[model samples]
Target: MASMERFLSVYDEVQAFLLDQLQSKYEIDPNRARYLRIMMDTTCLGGKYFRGMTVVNVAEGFLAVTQHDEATKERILHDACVGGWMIEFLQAHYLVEDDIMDGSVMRRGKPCWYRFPGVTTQCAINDGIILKSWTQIMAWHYFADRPFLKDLLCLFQKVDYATAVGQMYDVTSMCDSNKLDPEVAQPMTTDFAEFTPAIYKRIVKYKTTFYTYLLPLVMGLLVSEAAASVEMNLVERVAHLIGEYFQVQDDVMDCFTPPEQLGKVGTDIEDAKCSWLAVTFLGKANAAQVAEFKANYGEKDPAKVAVVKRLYSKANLQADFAAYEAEVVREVESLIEQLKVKSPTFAESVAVVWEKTHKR
Candidate 1:
């Protein structure tokens, strides 16, 4: 196994180099340079580097197939770490902007960058742009000479575009806290009309799965130049299932766990996200329960939020989620079992994700 501890050291070193590049790029203005450092420190550094680690992890697995010279292999590993870091950077870019759109307060256990003094919404948006731009800058700057440089760059672009479209699906599917005004705003109310598993699964595939799961793995393969040996369709199918399970887990956690425990306030009820809880509750509740559920489910008030929680309790989502979790674990296992024969490297790669995601 590649040393994650050493990998992070490489991650930190690249971050320093990026900062140096940016500082000189903006040398005309000391204040902007200072702000850039603050923004980078705030958004890019904290909270689990597991996504980036996945990039390196998968890359190492691909590299295991054929031995390069030790020196060249080490270089490839370093480049793989860069690929991983860019994904984390992309994550930072998404979250900073996503927090803005979601009207969020805290992220990674601290107040969001927009909430910080002086870094308010405007620069947060600009900072998000900068963070996203750096991923490309790093890619071009570091990996210009690689054979699959275009493939690597294209992978990021495609993921970025897909994730943004998925964000549109997610936002459009939910009720808006910002647009409730009768005269000025369009009625963005939560209707049970859009609560189907198919719609929820679509959101999961595009919104969370592509960037969250698929991009890292694809980046790994592309960085390793292992595309020729891989089943691209199998990776997509496996990623879809992982994505679905991951989103369901998030929805369950948002409702069931405390803000302190979850690292941020749970606002899925208030935001009226197309949560699994919402889908499950609406399905099981009677007509009268449905009426009451609709009345309080998307409201911003804490009491109304309480109403939604109570309904979830009555709907038995906790047990339901557990059952779903158990079944999905087994499903993923059974599929991966087949994959063990078809694509052992991919099987090994996704198994690590399944292991990382499930507690037991």
Candidate 2:
């Protein structure tokens, strides 16, 4: 496996680029706006950077296949870094508003962006909107000269549409009492059994997948003349499954992983954030248990948190989660084998992803 240092070096370079952009735009009055930088930097800390690397791996594979020059590969890698940064941008975009909605005090081991020293009240909502808009602008500016530019723009649009749909469903699931409209309503039988995982996967795919995984890889393929063909659809599907596994592991890490290693406390329970774990737990809860959960779970009550944990234990939901995690890892490995990307570059990338998915 490639050393952690090698992968992190790429991630850190992207992080620095993003932080520089944020600081440059918002640090006019460092004495006053310093908190913004801090807030942004703090939030940017600690992620697997899997999405950015997907792009680099894909680009490298394409280069190897097409005999592209090293300089060209490096350029694609740089843009892949930027593309990966866009995923973080999207995350920040969601987290800022989500923090307010959930009434969260902290994120990634620091105060929520809304609760920053200079920022209070409702203005933080607008800040999030601006941050997301800036992300779009940055993406456009950075990729304007690349080949298949139009297709890239369309990919962004498609991703935006899918993400909006998922976010709308997500927010409504939390706030709106009404169920999904008939046209989009998932059936309670099979759908419910799978809905939590489906939505979870969708959230990752639409919100985090293509931009993070597919786009970067596609960019590499396109830039290096490794265009997607009928056979490549299999690769795309495997990559999507890998993205899903990546997200499920993220949820597990967020809620169950230790703060010392994770560098942040899990707030999914308190914040009413709709994760697969929460949804799956609710789905399995009996009516009375569900009622108890509805009454006690979300909000800042330590006692209620304990109650939720107890209920989850009774339902053996954690075990279910564990089983599902293992299942997805198996699925991902199997699918990767089917794709059969023989290039050492692609294989290394896939191996790295496996290591991340199963890492302690």
Candidate 3:
């Protein structure tokens, strides 16, 4: 908890740095700059800072493994904090675009940026792009002279492209089955037969795993000049597993948890999402169950939603999820133990992430 407090303290510094960059580097009208400031504040600052804090925590862990002097440690911390901000900027950029794409009404308990007054979907698209540009500029500003600068840039580029590909799969997968008729009133219908666990794995891997789990830790190592010393493939492997666990938990929570607890209403059913629960239920369902699911799965009606919940209950999905959750915890812990053999600090850093995510 103390560490989290320290992590939150860095938010203001990152915010100030971003605002300073916008003011100094861009030649824009005062009102426009002020709008950008407001946009950044509203979209970027209020969410959970887990990804950014992962950067700081992992960097600090790696630094602790070494014997750096106080001044050198401070310099590395500053660089890593900047990298942390880079992660936040990347996250904000994605969320701004994704909210528009998903037609999301709320984010972080407020109306999404695209849904905000005076900010249409079209404007939000450009704003998202601008947020991404800020990440690249900040990387150049803070890391251009470092030995691992190219490596750091390459890491960011790779994660960005991978996330885009993941989003492509996610969006396209929703259009699969062709069961939803565009001309009809029922727009959310989907064929559960078309959504497989394999597709769910791929979508989560590409979209959520690399960027959400791997990027910050890798960036931490790069910023701390400890990249070469670590086994990156091993890190990726472990992180990928942890990432899967995180997304599966999220999918489960979306169905079982309330709207206020999740910070938004669960729309996986109505949106025809390729969720873990949906896929899992489909795999075990009989013909009658299948027919029932197809009837009630993606409709927006409250009674239909209630029927789907009853179906899930009848299928014992809650018990199955409990088993799945236990298995995921076991797998992740085993991987962390394996990681500890190579670098205990690195392992501990990942353990920190698992702890925080599991608690959530």
Candidate 4:
């Protein structure tokens, strides 16, 4: 519990650093800068900060194995902190584009970045790009003196490339949805199931998980400079599985959680998002169900939210999602156990992860 609390504290430090940097770097116009700062704050405001926490957890794991001193631990913590913030930064970058693309009105319980006052939608897009691009500069400046600087640069480069590739695949997949059918879906509407959910998972693996989980693990491994053959890929695979489940749970929460708990409008259904829920819906729903879902929830009618819930209930898809989520969680736990056999102290951090996951 103390370790988890320390991890959360480190997370707050990174958040403070991000806010301070935004204010100091973009203070040209008081009002405009504040708006930008607010948007940036919105990016950080929500989430359990799992990715950030994972970075710290994984880094500490490696530190335990290598038996680094207090000063070294602090430095590793600093890198883990920034690496976690970079994940959030990248997420915000995607959301900035996504909100415009999907015509979303809110994010993290606030107006979408694009919807801010006195700023054109185009400006929001630019702002998003700027936010993402600046993360690298931050990394370069802060970690320039570190021994793992080159590895850090390489990791970021790889993350950027993987995420970009994933984005391209996502955009292209959506554009070509007409070529897809529904019948093959495992749990959602059947007609379009063949083409989406699996691909959607792959897209997320590359775009979100690669950086969010793998970067942190690798960064920690590099810092610890562990045996090159300790099988870091295994760690990444476990973490990515966690990442997948995290996103899937998020999809479920967006629709089923209480309104106040949601903290934002439920746009997944309306936006035709390639979420796990939608994919499951495609697998489970009959043609009539699909049409009804489309008519009621797809067209942006507020009353349709309840109807969508009803459809999910009738389809028994929600239960299926719950079952699937549990299986994924168990799988991740098993993987953590496998990782634990390698190092008991590192395993302690992984155990902390299992405990922290439920808080969200």
Best model per TM-score: 1
Q: Kindly give the stretch of ten consecutive residues in candidate 2 with the minimal lDDT sum.
A: 186-195
lDDT of 3: 0.82
Residue 69's lDDT within candidate 4 is 75
Candidate 4 TM-score over all chains jointly: 0.78
What's the ranking of the predictions by lDDT, best on top?
A: 1, 3, 4, 2
Question: TM-scores across all candidates?
Answer: 0.92, 0.72, 0.91, 0.78
Q: Output the lDDT of residue 244, model 2.
A: 69
lDDT of each: 0.82, 0.62, 0.82, 0.68
Q: What order do you get sorting by TM-score, best first?
A: 1, 3, 4, 2
lDDT string, candidate 2, 169-267, tens digits: 555544433445656743222123324655556666765555555665565555455554324575577567767666666666767788766666776
Give me the runs in candidate 4 sitting further than 4 Å from their true place.
1-39, 45-47, 169-197, 226-229, 285-297, 302-306
Pairs of residues clashing in candidate 3:
none
TM-score of model 3 (CA atoms): 0.91
Off by over 4 Å in 1: 25-31, 175-184
Task: Return the number of clashes found in candidate 1.
Answer: 0
Clashing pairs in 2: none
Q: lDDT value for candidate 1?
A: 0.82
For residues 1-360, what per-residue lDDT tens digits would candidate 1 score against the true structure? Answer: 445876777767877787787668756366766777778878988777878888888877877777799888888888888888898889899999999998899887999888998888987898899899988888988898999898888878888998999898898776454554557755556566778888888888988888888888888888887776567877777778887888888888898888898999899988878999998888788998899988987778999999889988887777878888888888888877766665688679889987887762
Q: If both were scored by lDDT, which would come out higher, candidate 3 or candidate 4?
A: 3
Model 2: CA > 4 A from native: 1-48, 121-123, 174-207, 210-212, 229-236, 259-264, 271-274, 278-296, 341-348
- What local lDDT does model 4 show for residue 146? 74
